[PDB]
Amino acid sequence: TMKVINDPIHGHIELHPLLVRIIDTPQFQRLRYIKQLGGGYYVFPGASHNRFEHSLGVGYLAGCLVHALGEKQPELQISERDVLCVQIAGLCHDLGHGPFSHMFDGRFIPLARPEVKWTHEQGSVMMFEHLINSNGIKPVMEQYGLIPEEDIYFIKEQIVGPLESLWPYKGRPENKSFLYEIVSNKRNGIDVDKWDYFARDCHHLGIQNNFDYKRFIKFARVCEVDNELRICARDKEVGNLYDMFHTRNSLHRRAYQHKVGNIIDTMITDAFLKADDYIEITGAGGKKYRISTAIDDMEAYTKLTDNIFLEILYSTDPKLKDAREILKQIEYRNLFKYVGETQPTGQIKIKREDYESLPKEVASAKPKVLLDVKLKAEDFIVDVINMDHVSFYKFAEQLIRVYCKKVDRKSLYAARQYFVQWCADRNFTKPQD
Amino acid sequence: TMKVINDPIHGHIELHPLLVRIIDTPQFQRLRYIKQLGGGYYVFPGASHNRFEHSLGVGYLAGCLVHALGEKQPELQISERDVLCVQIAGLCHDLGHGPFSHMFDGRFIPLARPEVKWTHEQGSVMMFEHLINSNGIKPVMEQYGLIPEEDIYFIKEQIVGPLELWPYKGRPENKSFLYEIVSNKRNGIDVDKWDYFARDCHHLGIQNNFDYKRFIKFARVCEVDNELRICARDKEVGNLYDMFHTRNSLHRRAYQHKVGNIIDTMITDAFLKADDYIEITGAGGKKYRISTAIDDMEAYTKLTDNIFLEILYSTDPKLKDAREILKQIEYRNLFKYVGETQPTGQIKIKREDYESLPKEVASAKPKVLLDVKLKAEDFIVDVINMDYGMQEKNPIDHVSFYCKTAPNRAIRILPEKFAEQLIRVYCKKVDRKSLYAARQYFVQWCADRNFTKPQD
Numbered sequence A: 001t002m003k004v005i006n007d008p009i010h011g012h013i014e015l016h017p018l019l020v021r022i023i024d025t026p027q028f029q030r031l032r033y034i035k036q037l038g039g040g041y042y043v044f045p046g047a048s049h050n051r052f053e054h055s056l057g058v059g060y061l062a063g064c065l066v067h068a069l070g071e072k073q074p075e076l077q078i079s080e081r082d083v084l085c086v087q088i089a090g091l092c093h094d095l096g097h098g099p100f101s102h103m104f105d106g107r108f109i110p111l112a113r114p115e116v117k118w119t120h121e122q123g124s125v126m127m128f129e130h131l132i133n134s135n136g137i138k139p140v141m142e143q144y145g146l147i148p149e150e151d152i153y154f155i156k157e158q159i160v161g162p163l164e165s166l167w168p169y170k171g172r173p174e175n176k177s178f179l180y181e182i183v184s185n186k187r188n189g190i191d192v193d194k195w196d197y198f199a200r201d202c203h204h205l206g207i208q209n210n211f212d213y214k215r216f217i218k219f220a221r222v223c224e225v226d227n228e229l230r231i232c233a234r235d236k237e238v239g240n241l242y243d244m245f246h247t248r249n250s251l252h253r254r255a256y257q258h259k260v261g262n263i264i265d266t267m268i269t270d271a272f273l274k275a276d277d278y279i280e281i282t283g284a285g286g287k288k289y290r291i292s293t294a295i296d297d298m299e300a301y302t303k304l305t306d307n308i309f310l311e312i313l314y315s316t317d318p319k320l321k322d323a324r325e326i327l328k329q330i331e332y333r334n335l336f337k338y339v340g341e342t343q344p345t346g347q348i349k350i351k352r353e354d355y356e357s358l359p360k361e362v363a364s365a366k367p368k369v370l371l372d373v374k375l376k377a378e379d380f381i382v383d384v385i386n387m388d389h390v391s392f393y394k395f396a397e398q399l400i401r402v403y404c405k406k407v408d409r410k411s412l413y414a415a416r417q418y419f420v421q422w423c424a425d426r427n428f429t430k431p432q433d
Numbered sequence B: 001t002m003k004v005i006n007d008p009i010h011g012h013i014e015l016h017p018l019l020v021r022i023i024d025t026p027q028f029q030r031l032r033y034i035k036q037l038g039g040g041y042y043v044f045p046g047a048s049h050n051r052f053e054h055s056l057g058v059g060y061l062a063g064c065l066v067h068a069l070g071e072k073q074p075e076l077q078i079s080e081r082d083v084l085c086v087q088i089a090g091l092c093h094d095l096g097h098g099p100f101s102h103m104f105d106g107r108f109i110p111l112a113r114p115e116v117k118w119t120h121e122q123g124s125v126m127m128f129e130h131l132i133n134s135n136g137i138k139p140v141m142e143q144y145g146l147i148p149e150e151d152i153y154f155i156k157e158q159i160v161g162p163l164e165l166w167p168y169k170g171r172p173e174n175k176s177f178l179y180e181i182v183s184n185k186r187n188g189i190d191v192d193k194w195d196y197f198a199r200d201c202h203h204l205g206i207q208n209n210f211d212y213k214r215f216i217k218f219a220r221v222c223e224v225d226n227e228l229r230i231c232a233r234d235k236e237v238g239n240l241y242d243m244f245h246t247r248n249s250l251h252r253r254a255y256q257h258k259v260g261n262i263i264d265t266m267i268t269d270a271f272l273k274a275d276d277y278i279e280i281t282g283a284g285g286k287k288y289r290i291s292t293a294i295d296d297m298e299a300y301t302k303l304t305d306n307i308f309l310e311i312l313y314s315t316d317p318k319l320k321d322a323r324e325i326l327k328q329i330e331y332r333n334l335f336k337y338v339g340e341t342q343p344t345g346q347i348k349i350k351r352e353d354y355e356s357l358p359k360e361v362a363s364a365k366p367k368v369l370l371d372v373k374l375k376a377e378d379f380i381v382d383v384i385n386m387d388y389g390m391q392e393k394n395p396i397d398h399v400s401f402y403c404k405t406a407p408n409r410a411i412r413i414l415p416e417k418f419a420e421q422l423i424r425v426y427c428k429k430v431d432r433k434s435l436y437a438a439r440q441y442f443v444q445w446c447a448d449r450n451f452t453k454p455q456d
């Protein structure tokens, strides 16, 4: 029962029955209703792709790499069981994403609940657990040779990292440390996750992809480094890697950090914040959750997708009028206006818990040339945008942009002044344009 | 100094301000929430694309073609005004599509209201009218040289055809060729098809062998039977064959996919079970159902693929049945394929008769009586058309060519064959006995009807 799925990036993807069973669940199929690039679709009409197809792709590539390593180096003792667990991890690494992907955990939850610590990865673990239990996957795992308790632990570790000196992982021993570099590779940012989305995003955006992932897989090997096992590239592949990094940079410059695309993300977020008190999502035991609290209950979170945009847009409730009106601004293309950009000096990083305060700080700033119209915190949006040792055998770490909700020439002028001053008060770089 | 949109199929698409204004409306942006291939996404994960981006592409290509014709043959007197009206028509030809595109007008409305005669094209006209009025587009049209009353008429005619010698009132007969750009019924060669062949191929992973740019570049208006028509250079004949083979591949591989079509009928089943209980607010606070929203454009504006998730995420006990079918789709417990047949040599099945077909099948009398009997609600009968209205033809016959030396007049003159109507039957009961039974009813029904005999 080896099922085959046609993908425009990878061609034929063969799926193990166990994977098919994980895929055919509400928890996984949910990913069909979550846009890969969030608000990017509103700037790039080719970018209609969702997390679902990306996740299949990552699961596929994860398998290809591990399987290839096992053939070339049977001394690594990569079992078929190891292969499946890595595939599953690749499949399920994005289960925890929320509406509009990175917009949700990167901005909405911070602004809505600054107290809480939340990442989509943590979400992926919770949702995976929920998926397993809700659909009786453990017996099916056993039926294909897996040992649920340790293997489920391994899968979770691949996704989120060590779960809390030593070898921190408990799902596999240190002699298989290389397996933890396939799906999510923290240290050098080279994993199959990135391979898929670079290729996929390029394909949909109309941007040229220079990296050849197959070639890289074909020439990859596990090799000794600092008395540790790591995945290593042949020296002949160095050009291919440069091409990868250039593709990455292009995607970030051209798409991920696009000026209007990011503005639209903050407008969508603004609408969610205005809707959060009034939207009800039913979770476990009939209990009711808000957009911002659905992350606390996986039954509710399952039903939280980009649909929430249209539920607000199509609503008639008077209580949702404000939220609805912002989404209508997007349709009519009356967007927030770009004021300017700056960076934090030093190794200083504005943190998520502080995001909510930033608009007030900006309005609190005192421009020396006092002006006619004064602006308040509600009129400002402050957007914080985040972001050679691979083994062989201009990058801004944080950008800060400010937008204004009032498009009046004088308000824009004013806003600029507040912004410039705020940068000065914080010893941030001085705005240009 | 006009706006540019990056598209993966066409590259840079330059948009006239007036087009930008039509695009930035709820009525147009609605197309972002309607899947091009409907239930095809549930089989082809690459096919996440929506009608919106397709519509930009068609608008763009419509403009390219007309503009190219005007440069090569200024004796045609194609104004800038003409160009814009054709672009707008290309932009807006799909405004009338409903949830899951062709599933909606092709199956749901027929099953829900067999009385009514509805096409997405008619919808596009109504929605266009609604778009114009709701967003004060007439003054803006005037501001860029258009004459709203006649030009709006022309645009609508390009989309739906004529209403009620020369049938068109939006442009005179000496510009008859303009009516062949966006929608060409006669020979099925228009910019609409060019975009979706390319776009669908790009998303499905199927190779596209037609080269639309080349065709545009060598296209010319030329005399045929004292009729002005768009004519291809004789050198382009291979390119055309490639187009028709691409079309055939897309249909065989994608549009007629077995499970994809099953899923379309499951979605439709859910809608039918939800239709009584879903309320959509239209004009003046009046409430409409999924099946009646087509009667009110304010309501229809809010009718998109979202309706799938509204049903899926619902808690109302009255929607339990509809909801349960959509859950079957998530769990991948689909209706079961019984078999396939054709009305070869027969009169073809019409939309108003779709609702009756499941009863006919259960009414059929198999010779070998089975242990269990089945009823009409257990059968789905799916009628698949390549192009519903049209006669079984060869479309190359209606293509005009020209030789370069005598470019003013048309030349005097191994593709695939069409099964222009397929009929499939699915069963809602998945147990061996019922499936066996269903097969028997089906085989008999084909016999009773002088349809082709089912194979495997």
Ligand SMILES: Nc1nc2c(ncn2[C@@H]2O[C@H](COP(=O)(O)OP(=O)(O)OP(=O)(O)O)[C@@H](O)[C@H]2O)c(=O)[nH]1
Binding pocket: A003, A004, A005, A006, A020, A023, A024, B041, B042, B043, B044, B045, B259, B332, B334
């Ligand atoms: N199961 C499944 N298949 C998908 C999905 N998305 C795309 N597909 C593809 O669509 C095809 C049809 O769905 P299935 O019902 O699994 O197809 P099938 O081959 O008839 O399999 P059975 O019905 O189980 O015999 C699959 O073979 C896959 O190639 C998905 O989410 N789940």
Ligand SMILES: Nc1nc2c(ncn2[C@@H]2O[C@H](COP(=O)(O)OP(=O)(O)OP(=O)(O)O)[C@@H](O)[C@H]2O)c(=O)[nH]1
Binding pocket: A041, A042, A043, A044, A045, A260, A333, A335, B003, B004, B005, B006, B020, B023, B024
């Ligand atoms: N206007 C508009 N632009 C879109 C749409 N879809 C994608 N885009 C692209 O998104 C870009 C940014 O949107 P705009 O608000 O037009 O931004 P802009 O190009 O800076 O134009 P202004 O904001 O009017 O100066 C556009 O230039 C288009 O290339 C759409 O539906 N409407």
Ligand SMILES: [Zn+2]
Binding pocket: A054, A058, A093, A094, A193, A197
């Ligand atoms: Zn990912």
Ligand SMILES: [Zn+2]
Binding pocket: B054, B058, B093, B094, B192, B196
């Ligand atoms: Zn179309």
